[PDB]
C-alpha cells in the first residue's frame, strides 16, 4: 500500500537485496546499457553511496522491511556541472505497478532541491521504456532531445536514447 | 605546418607531455568539468587507453615529435550502447589555430569506421565553446539538443551542454 510504502536512507545491509534487481535489469537488457560482467562488489561500488560528494543511495521498503527498489543520486558532472544532480533506479520485477518508481523518484527531486542542485539530468533513458519516459514526464521532466539508434533493443532493434531534464 | 602534422597511437612516454594540457583545461575551467583534484595518475588513468573494449588514444606531433594535443576514443556506453563511440580532445594553447583539433577529430572519425561503430556521440559540449561547436559541426556533427545552465563558466555564468551526434 501508499501507506506501508518508505523510502529511506540505504543501509549495507541492503545491498544483497538490491543485488537481484541490477542482475535482472543487465539480463533483459531493456533499460540501461551496462557492462555485462560486472562482479557482485563493482556494482556495489556503483550503486551504494559512500560518505564524503553530494549523493545518496535510497531503498524503498514495504512495512515488512522487504526492499522493493532502490534510487541513487549523485552530481552529473564534477567541478563546474556539480549543480546538476543525476539518479538512477531500479524497481523489482514483482514491485512494478505498487508506485514505487513515482515514490523513489519524487523523493530524489526532494533530496536535490534540499541539497541546493538546480537542475536534474538523465543522461540516457531508452524511448521504448515509455512506462519510466510518461513517469518522468508526470513528475516533470521533458526530452532535451534523443540521440538515435543509440540502444539495441533485443526486440525493438536500434532505438533512441533520451536526454532528460527538469528545473529545480 | 600541415605537412609536419601527424596523428598517430599514444606512447606511455608521451603522457608528460599530455598532463599540462589537462591542467590547463581544468584551470580555465571553459570548455570540460572534471574534477579538479585528480592526481597525476588518476588523470592518466582516465586519459591513456590500456590495451584490451574498442579504446584508443593518440597524439598529434610535430616534425620534431613535440605533441601539440592529444585525443582519446572509446564505446560511449558498454553492452547494448557500444554502438555508439564517443571522444574526449586536449589541444595545447601554444598550437591553436595550426589545426590540430580538425585533425584530431577526424582521425578519430576514421578510426571508429573502421572499428565498426555506428555514430559518435558527444555528451557535454560547452555552447560558448563556439571554436569547438563549429568545427564539429563542420566535420559532420549536429546538435540533439542543449541542457540549459548546465555548465558554470567563469565569464558567462551558466550556460548550455550541447549533446551532439555523427552517423557512421
Same mark, same amino acid.
Given at each position: 500500500?501508499?501507506?506501508?510504502?518508505?523510502?529511506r536512507d540505504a543501509e549495507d545491509a541492503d545491498w544483497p537485496a538490491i543485488?537481484?534487481?541490477?542482475?535482472?535489469?543487465?539480463?533483459?537488457?531493456?533499460?540501461?546499457?551496462?557492462?555485462?560482467?560486472?562482479?557482485?562488489?563493482?556494482?556495489?561500488?556503483?550503486?551504494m553511496t559512500?560518505?564524503?560528494?553530494?549523493?545518496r543511495t535510497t531503498v +524503498?521498503v514495504?512495512?515488512?522491511g522487504?526492499v522493493?527498489?532502490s +534510487?541513487?543520486?549523485?552530481?552529473?558532472?564534477?567541478?563546474?556541472?556539480?549543480?546538476?544532480?543525476?539518479?538512477?533506479?531500479?524497481?523489482? +520485477?514483482?514491485?512494478?505497478?505498487?508506485?514505487?518508481?513515482?515514490?523513489?523518484?519524487?523523493?530524489?527531486?526532494?533530496?536535490?532541491?534540499?541539497?541546493?542542485?538546480?537542475?536534474?539530468?538523465?543522461?540516457?533513458?531508452?524511448?521504448?521504456?515509455?512506462?519510466?519516459?510518461?513517469?518522468?514526464?508526470?513528475?516533470?521532466?521533458?526530452?532535451?532531445?534523443?540521440?538515435?539508434? +543509440?540502444?539495441?533493443?533485443?526486440?525493438?532493434?536500434?532505438?533512441?536514447?533520451?536526454?532528460?531534464?527538469?528545473?529545480?
Amino acid at each position: 500500500s501508499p501507506e506501508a510504502l518508505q523510502v529511506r536512507d540505504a543501509e549495507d545491509a541492503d545491498w544483497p537485496a538490491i543485488l537481484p534487481f541490477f542482475r535482472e535489469i543487465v539480463s533483459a537488457g531493456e533499460t540501461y546499457a551496462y557492462d555485462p560482467e560486472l562482479t557482485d562488489e563493482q556494482a556495489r561500488s556503483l550503486w551504494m553511496t559512500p560518505s564524503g560528494p553530494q549523493s545518496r543511495t535510497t531503498v +524503498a521498503v514495504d512495512a515488512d522491511g522487504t526492499v522493493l527498489g532502490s +534510487a541513487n543520486m549523485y552530481p552529473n558532472r564534477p567541478g563546474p556541472g556539480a549543480h546538476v544532480a543525476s539518479a538512477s533506479f531500479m524497481v523489482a +520485477a514483482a514491485a512494478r505497478g505498487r508506485g514505487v518508481g513515482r515514490a523513489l523518484c519524487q523523493d530524489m527531486i526532494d533530496w536535490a532541491g534540499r541539497e541546493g542542485f538546480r537542475a536534474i539530468q538523465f543522461n540516457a533513458v531508452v524511448e521504448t521504456n515509455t512506462v519510466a519516459v510518461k513517469l518522468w514526464q508526470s513528475l516533470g521532466f521533458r526530452v532535451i532531445g534523443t540521440v538515435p539508434e +543509440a540502444f539495441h533493443h533485443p526486440t525493438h532493434g536500434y532505438v533512441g536514447l533520451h536526454v532528460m531534464h527538469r528545473p529545480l
